[PDB]
């Protein structure tokens, strides 16, 4: 849930 998987 970090990197590309983090929602912004």
């Amino acid at each position, epitope marked *: *849930a*970090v990197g*590309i998987g*983090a929602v912004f």
Partner: antibody
Amino acid sequence: VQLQESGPGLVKPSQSLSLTCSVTGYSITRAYYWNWIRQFPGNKLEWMGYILYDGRSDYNPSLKNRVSITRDTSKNQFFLKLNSVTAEDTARYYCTREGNYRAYWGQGTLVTVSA
Amino acid sequence: DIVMTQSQKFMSTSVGDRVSITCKASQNVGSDVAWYQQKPGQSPKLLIYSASNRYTGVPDRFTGSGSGTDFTLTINNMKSEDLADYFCQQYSSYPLTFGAGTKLELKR
């Protein structure tokens, strides 16, 4: 977004390696993770660290205290400094933008650590 | 240090064959895994995200699947333009970690 790495391609051992990532098409204070990742000879990939859009940063423990990632929000650039380099730091250095299930990478820039 | 182990470093294939690359995570990473494709002289490019989802522009012949510690990238009907190195990556937590990469070769 477009990312472009720049900096000296030859660094003497024990000195510091500095690279700049120039970002265009997106604001580095707006969103995501802004990373440095390097690729060794033999193609192994290692993630070095990030600076977040809010200026917080974190690093791969494999790098000890050697690494610092920093930014210029006026120029929309972020920066890598890696202290006390050795030959095993020879690599192609990439900067990336990650988040929201997107990944953008620069073309990378080779740095050779040699005397 | 979540370690991503890829099966074999080099795989020989023929055009039109299905090829499957596998990556085994040391801990449970859920669905948070990406596959990257890297052609010579190019940066890696994201191929699959969230283990099953093709990225923008990626052809339908690429599929991925798996959960837990086991993940697969599938090339259905290999093409010559798929000659490349492939890397799994986990984004469950930092530090990000990549598989060692698999190089495809075409038989002729």
